[PDB]
Design an enzyme around this catalytic site. Structure first.
Site, PDB file in Angstrom:
ATOM      1  N   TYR A 145     -28.584  72.542 -25.496  1.00 15.36           N
ATOM      2  CA  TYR A 145     -27.918  72.911 -24.252  1.00 15.36           C
ATOM      3  C   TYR A 145     -28.386  72.013 -23.110  1.00 15.36           C
ATOM      4  O   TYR A 145     -27.570  71.442 -22.384  1.00 15.36           O
ATOM      5  CB  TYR A 145     -28.213  74.372 -23.891  1.00 15.36           C
ATOM      6  CG  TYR A 145     -27.698  74.758 -22.519  1.00 15.36           C
ATOM      7  CD1 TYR A 145     -26.341  74.990 -22.301  1.00 15.36           C
ATOM      8  CD2 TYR A 145     -28.563  74.823 -21.424  1.00 15.36           C
ATOM      9  CE1 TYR A 145     -25.853  75.276 -21.027  1.00 15.36           C
ATOM     10  CE2 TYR A 145     -28.088  75.103 -20.144  1.00 15.36           C
ATOM     11  CZ  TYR A 145     -26.733  75.330 -19.950  1.00 15.36           C
ATOM     12  OH  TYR A 145     -26.267  75.623 -18.687  1.00 15.36           O
ATOM     13  N   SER A 164     -27.811  72.018 -14.391  1.00 19.94           N
ATOM     14  CA  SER A 164     -28.792  73.037 -14.750  1.00 19.94           C
ATOM     15  C   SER A 164     -30.255  72.656 -14.583  1.00 19.94           C
ATOM     16  O   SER A 164     -30.649  71.518 -14.830  1.00 19.94           O
ATOM     17  CB  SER A 164     -28.559  73.489 -16.193  1.00 19.94           C
ATOM     18  OG  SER A 164     -29.650  74.255 -16.664  1.00 19.94           O
ATOM     19  N   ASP A 218     -37.612  77.932 -24.392  1.00 16.17           N
ATOM     20  CA  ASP A 218     -37.740  78.624 -23.117  1.00 16.17           C
ATOM     21  C   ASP A 218     -38.763  77.932 -22.217  1.00 16.17           C
ATOM     22  O   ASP A 218     -39.789  77.446 -22.692  1.00 16.17           O
ATOM     23  CB  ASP A 218     -38.157  80.073 -23.374  1.00 16.17           C
ATOM     24  CG  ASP A 218     -38.054  80.937 -22.145  1.00 16.17           C
ATOM     25  OD1 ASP A 218     -36.974  80.950 -21.515  1.00 16.17           O
ATOM     26  OD2 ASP A 218     -39.051  81.612 -21.817  1.00 16.17           O
ATOM     27  N   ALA A 275     -13.205  81.822 -24.011  1.00 16.62           N
ATOM     28  CA  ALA A 275     -14.228  81.720 -25.043  1.00 16.62           C
ATOM     29  C   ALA A 275     -15.330  82.734 -24.761  1.00 16.62           C
ATOM     30  O   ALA A 275     -15.752  83.464 -25.651  1.00 16.62           O
ATOM     31  CB  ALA A 275     -14.808  80.319 -25.065  1.00 16.62           C
ATOM     32  N   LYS A 294     -26.258  69.431 -20.516  1.00 17.92           N
ATOM     33  CA  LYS A 294     -26.249  69.553 -19.066  1.00 17.92           C
ATOM     34  C   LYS A 294     -26.764  68.276 -18.427  1.00 17.92           C
ATOM     35  O   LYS A 294     -26.315  67.893 -17.345  1.00 17.92           O
ATOM     36  CB  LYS A 294     -27.102  70.739 -18.611  1.00 17.92           C
ATOM     37  CG  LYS A 294     -26.588  72.098 -19.050  1.00 17.92           C
ATOM     38  CD  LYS A 294     -25.539  72.678 -18.104  1.00 17.92           C
ATOM     39  CE  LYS A 294     -24.155  72.072 -18.277  1.00 17.92           C
ATOM     40  NZ  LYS A 294     -23.125  72.889 -17.540  1.00 17.92           N
ATOM     41  N   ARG A 299     -39.141  82.819 -12.680  1.00 12.22           N
ATOM     42  CA  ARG A 299     -37.853  82.196 -12.424  1.00 12.22           C
ATOM     43  C   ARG A 299     -37.477  82.261 -10.953  1.00 12.22           C
ATOM     44  O   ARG A 299     -37.988  83.093 -10.197  1.00 12.22           O
ATOM     45  CB  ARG A 299     -36.768  82.887 -13.254  1.00 12.22           C
ATOM     46  CG  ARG A 299     -36.870  82.638 -14.750  1.00 12.22           C
ATOM     47  CD  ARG A 299     -36.359  81.252 -15.109  1.00 12.22           C
ATOM     48  NE  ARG A 299     -36.421  81.011 -16.548  1.00 12.22           N
ATOM     49  CZ  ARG A 299     -37.530  80.701 -17.211  1.00 12.22           C
ATOM     50  NH1 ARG A 299     -38.684  80.585 -16.565  1.00 12.22           N
ATOM     51  NH2 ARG A 299     -37.487  80.513 -18.522  1.00 12.22           N
TER      52      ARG A 299
END
Ligand SMILES: NC(=O)c1ccc[n+]([C@@H]2O[C@H](COP(=O)([O-])OP(=O)(O)OC[C@H]3O[C@@H](n4cnc5c(N)ncnc54)[C@H](O)[C@@H]3O)[C@@H](O)[C@H]2O)c1
Ligand SMILES: NC(=O)c1ccc[n+]([C@@H]2O[C@H](COP(=O)([O-])OP(=O)(O)OC[C@H]3O[C@@H](n4cnc5c(N)ncnc54)[C@H](O)[C@@H]3O)[C@@H](O)[C@H]2O)c1
Ligand SMILES: O=c1ccn([C@@H]2O[C@H](COP(=O)(O)OP(=O)(O)O[C@H]3O[C@H](CO)[C@@H](O)[C@H](O)[C@H]3O)[C@@H](O)[C@H]2O)c(=O)[nH]1
Ligand SMILES: O=c1ccn([C@@H]2O[C@H](COP(=O)(O)OP(=O)(O)O[C@H]3O[C@H](CO)[C@@H](O)[C@H](O)[C@H]3O)[C@@H](O)[C@H]2O)c(=O)[nH]1
Lengths: 340, 340
Positions: free
Chosen positions: B165, B141, B301, B49, B169, B233
């Site tokens: 998403y 995650s 975000d 995918a 998770k 991050r």
């Protein structure tokens, strides 16, 4: 007069289009009966996985011919996005009840439960959102409280899930919140607490305690109590749950993207229930002299469950007028007629 | 010597059978390279995918012919229970990486993400459980922390999901916990924090920041910074993530049914990253003189993300030996060869 009573009077004057998924089930068919009687227009979606055509037939025999013609039924699956978009076409309020309840069922078959409860739920959000619906109300569950012992139950304090089913019901809340953050599609989730009443399937191996027990006593079979019988529940008569649904479907913005406990704030031990049903059936000319048969606790089962409905009373004006006794009195005659 | 180093030495002596779902992807193909080099036997499941046959081809060119023959590849879909049972046949350790990452992707298409990330994940649990596997490790995650601001990030303190998403998770963690309660099937979930390194797809519209930026500088295109660039991050070099996986796959029972943060506990602002990559590329004979183009923040975000890996260091003996600089130095040459 409560907010629901005035709403009962207002609705017939300014009719709206409602969508009920799982309309052929217990809670769904009851919502249907109420809405059609309030002269509302209703669209229904169901695949008969656990629902019955008889529930729809019974409703037809209970509503006027005119009110029944205000009903559009779609035999579809919420796992099918096409059927969802179809059912949401030109709809004002969505009352999502389509799901596969029963903890035991989800435990011995988590995949089947996941498909409907999570995938199907997600499809409904998209379809409702894309149809520009005015409100989206979905059936949540008190199982989300999981292990957490504390009582009464408060919406902001939840425990860890004790079964696959509980996970799916909690995920309905998660996706609902996210759809509010990302698309501005606000919803209202109702955490039901053991609903009961007419049309709650007494057959099958996953039937709820009240239908199962009531049915067994009428037939003269043994009644099984899983545990010591001290397990307590906040049994919520169907009528109280219907109130919450219509209330949530038409609540102000300040009440959206919020989850509420829907029960009566009462505590009934399984041992009290046994006698409530037996005595209730006795008032209707049904004699049962068998004692309950106690066996091991059931897996993925919660010990105590009491709900604090102050949040629902405060933000939705929720005002349940049916304790277990009243509900049992209203329910028993129905089951006797059903099994006859 | 760390626990991983000794494990590196032990594995080749007592070879086991490993299963890597999403083996053709970034993290999956790297796990494959490492395991084959440790002379382990590996089974892989992927539907391409988002993965690539080239990732598998690259691995073959990097491992010995003998080690490559210890690899069995299955072109299947984790949404297909048949393929799952097939991939888990006679497997010792399962390293589940198959999923559809990218928050933006899940936001503009939550259904497609739900299907693989939740349904597929659930199928793998059943298949792994039914195959009587020795261990199940899955890719979680850091998105699960959601809104919660506090830093560093601690495993027990999570916020509310900021995207579809993130929900999927988080649901992987929920179902993992329940499978432990109901079936005694314990798992270990690793909350990754922005992994990067060789084979992380730089193409497509959902490529991660490092691959996207590195690729753009080599090509001489503009680099876009979503926000002020102060977004920080905890970039975790692939090698550190591989360590955690093998570590979790072979951890003692006391370490099971637990989730861990996998990163280095470092903080890198997007503005620092821009220069780290540019300078890194410059050391390799790649000149880039363009300044970053700042645009609006991206939806769904997170502002800051720093991880406390003490839980992983304490219970798994996790000891990452790669900071962003080392990782960038190792990664840059790869991308230059890839785009050439
Ligand atoms: N009954 C309770 O005490 C209780 C407690 C908590 C939550 N709930 C929730 O209330 C909702 C309704 O419960 P109920 O007791 O009326 O059960 P029910 O089984 O009588 O109603 C569920 C209906 O949904 C339909 N359905 C199931 N999967 C479907 C699918 N994939 N596509 C289309 N239709 C589908 C079934 O045919 C059934 O008619 C459920 O979502 C349940 O999780 C009920
Ligand atoms: N990369 C990060 O920084 C990061 C951070 C947190 C979590 N993760 C997780 O790590 C895992 C791997 O991420 P990655 O960066 O290597 O991405 P990747 O897209 O390079 O790898 C995912 C692989 O899974 C395969 N896949 C997807 N759906 C599948 C399905 N339904 N059936 C079979 N195969 C399928 C894809 O083909 C792909 O090869 C993902 O689960 C992701 O959620 C990654
Ligand atoms: O023959 C029986 C059936 C049930 N019980 C017990 O009675 C209690 C209630 O049973 P049940 O009606 O299945 O309640 P729950 O386990 O709370 O499940 C209710 O609440 C769930 C989550 O809210 C919903 O999914 C279900 O539809 C709804 O029945 C449980 O402790 C059971 O162990 C018995 O002792 N004997
Ligand atoms: O061209 C670009 C691409 C990204 N960013 C920014 O850089 C940061 C990191 O981007 P990204 O690599 O997509 O990180 P995340 O949003 O943290 O997503 C990472 O973490 C997710 C959840 O842990 C995983 O699903 C993803 O695979 C992984 O990329 C974000 O603030 C982006 O806005 C830019 O400024 N410019």
């Amino acid at each position: 007069m409560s907010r629901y009573e005035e709403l009962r009077k207002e609705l017939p004057a300014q009719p709206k289009v409602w969508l009920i998924t799982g309309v052929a089930g217990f809670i769904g068919s009851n919502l249907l009966e109420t809405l059609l009687k309030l002269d509302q227009k209703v669209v229904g979606l169901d695949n008969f996985a656990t629902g019955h055509q008889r529930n729809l037939d019974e409703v037809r025999s209970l509503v006027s011919e005119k009110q029944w013609s205000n009903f559009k039924f779609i035999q579809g699956d919420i796992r099918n996005l096409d059927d969802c978009n179809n059912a949401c076409a030109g709809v004002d309020y969505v009352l999502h009840q389509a799901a596969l309840g029963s903890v035991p069922r989800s435990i011995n078959d988590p995949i089947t439960s996941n498909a409907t409860n999570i995938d199907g739920f997600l499809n409904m959000l998209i379809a409702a959102r894309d149809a520009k619906v005015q409100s989206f109300t979905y059936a949540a569950s008190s199982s989300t409280y999981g292990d957490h012992p504390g009582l009464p139950k408060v919406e902001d304090t939840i425990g860890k899930p004790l079964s696959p089913y509980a996970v799916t019901k909690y995920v309905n809340e998660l996706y609902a919140d996210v759809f509010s953050r990302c698309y501005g599609f606000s919803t209202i989730g109702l955490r039901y607490f053991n609903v009961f009443g007419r049309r709650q399937d007494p057959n099958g191996a996953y039937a709820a305690v009240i239908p199962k027990w009531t049915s067994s006593m009428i037939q003269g079979d043994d009644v099984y109590i899983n545990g010591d019988g001290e397990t307590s529940r906040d049994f919520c008569y169907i009528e109280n749950t219907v109130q919450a649904n219509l209330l949530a479907a038409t609540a102000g913005l300040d009440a959206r993207n919020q989850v509420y406990n829907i029960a009566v704030g009462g505590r009934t031990s399984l041992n009290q229930l046994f006698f409530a049903l037996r005595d209730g059936l006795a008032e209707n000319g049904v004699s049962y002299h068998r004692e309950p048969v106690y066996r091991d606790f059931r897996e993925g089962d919660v010990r105590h469950s009491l709900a604090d409905i102050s949040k629902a009373a405060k933000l939705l004006g929720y005002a349940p007028k049916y304790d277990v006794s009243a509900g049992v009195a209203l329910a028993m005659p129905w089951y006797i007629m059903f099994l006859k």
